[PDB]
């Protein structure tokens, strides 16, 4: 299940 507050930026 996905964390909505995971990092949404490019790596």
């Amino acid at each position: 299940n996905a964390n909505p507050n995971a990092n949404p930026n490019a790596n």
Partner: antibody
Amino acid sequence: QVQLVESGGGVVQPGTSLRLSCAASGFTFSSYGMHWVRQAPGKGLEWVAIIWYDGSKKYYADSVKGRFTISRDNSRNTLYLQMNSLRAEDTAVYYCAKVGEGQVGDSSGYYDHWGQGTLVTVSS
Amino acid sequence: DIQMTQSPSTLSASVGDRVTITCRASQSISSWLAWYQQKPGKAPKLLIYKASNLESGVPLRFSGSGSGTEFTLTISSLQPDDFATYYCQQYNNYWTFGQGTKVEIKR
């Protein structure tokens, strides 16, 4: 310096749909997640939606779920909010907001830059 | 949701005063708390993120403290530009704002 310019707001009738835009510049737009946040006249700030840098994940506030869609066109540095089945209580200034960098490892979602906002007035 | 409650909702202060605004989360949010300033008709501007980290360019009179469920924003010596509304925001699980605290001029 970061610039975020919203457009598309105006007076619309209830039950119609409307698309908002946010033109981004002064940073690498395609590397950042983005959010929309809104503020009804005289009220507080309300988070609306988030989209990943690559569009691969989107989340929405329960108040707009099933009615609003966030999207983006990275080749044009533009963020969109598609608002369907508009209601009187969607009247608000809509802000686009860039995700702040954070320190390494941090949970995400504070906003280091905000647009000036675009006013949507839902009225007959 | 994680409900954010600021205290007080309105604060009357004078220039030069030490001013503290409190923000409590109904669930533990670790350090993931930001503060914003808003003036009438203008977009909000970021002051503090990760509870205590001053955003680059923000004046040094602004600071923040806390973790878990209780947080504060302090203006060490209030200036005329500081009369405004302040919001906290958690970004631990989804994203929610406090109701705002207006800092008004005492007379």
